[PDB]
């Protein structure tokens, strides 16, 4: 009982620690991915802000 | 909203860009027609000489 119980609590606390490190990785993942995705949403927006002048010129001709 | 404002800007630009050239062309063709009215009498004669031998 003591070997299996210490094994259970030890494995579960090491699960806490390794999934805590994995939590650190996911927090960094979300922060970095928001830093990336801001750029792509601004990219499609600026595609619109240029395409308005593009269609302006297309009808200017 | 801002590209709708640009869509509106295109119209403000087109009114000037058309009407100014249009006024120039109207007055130009009017000057050219009333100028030719002194010369069309002479320019009619070659057609006469062409049709009749």
DSSP labels, B1-53: -HHHHHHHHHHHHHHHHHHHHHHHHHHHHHHHHHHHTTTHHHHTHHHHHHH--
- How far does B30 lie from chain A, in Å, by closest CA? 27
In this structure, what DSSP letter does residue A45 have? H
- Residues of A within 8 A of B3 (CB-CB) are 48-49, 52
Experimentally, the structure was elucidated by cryo-EM
Residue of A nearest to B4 (CA): A52
C-alpha to C-alpha distance for B36 and B14, rounded to whole angstroms: 33
Interface residue A35 vs chain B (CB under 8 A): no
C-alpha to C-alpha distance for B51 and B53, rounded to whole angstroms: 7
C-alpha to C-alpha distance for B14 and B6, rounded to whole angstroms: 12
Read off the tokens for B48.
């006469």
Helix (H/G/I), strand (E/B), else coil: A25: helix
Largest Cα–Cα separation, chain A: 87
CB pairs under 8 A between A and B: 10
Question: Which residues does B7 contact at the CB level (< 8 Å), separation at least 6?
Answer: A52
Resolution of the entry in angstroms: 3.3
Read off the tokens for B28.
């130009």
């Amino acid at each position: 009982t003591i070997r299996n119980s210490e094994e259970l609590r030890g494995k579960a606390i090491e699960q806490l620690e390794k999934a805590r490190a994995r939590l650190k990785k996911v927090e960094m993942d979300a922060d970095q991915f928001r830093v990336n995705g801001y750029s792509e949403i601004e990219r499609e927006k600026m595609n619109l802000i240029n395409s308005t002048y593009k269609t302006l010129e297309q009808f200017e001709n | 909203l801002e590209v709708e404002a640009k869509l509106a800007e295109g119209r403000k630009k087109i009114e000037v860009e058309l009407q100014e050239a249009l006024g120039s062309l109207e007055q130009q063709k009017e000057d050219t027609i009333k100028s030719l009215d002194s010369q069309i009498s002479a320019l009619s004669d070659d057609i006469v000489k062409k049709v009749l031998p």
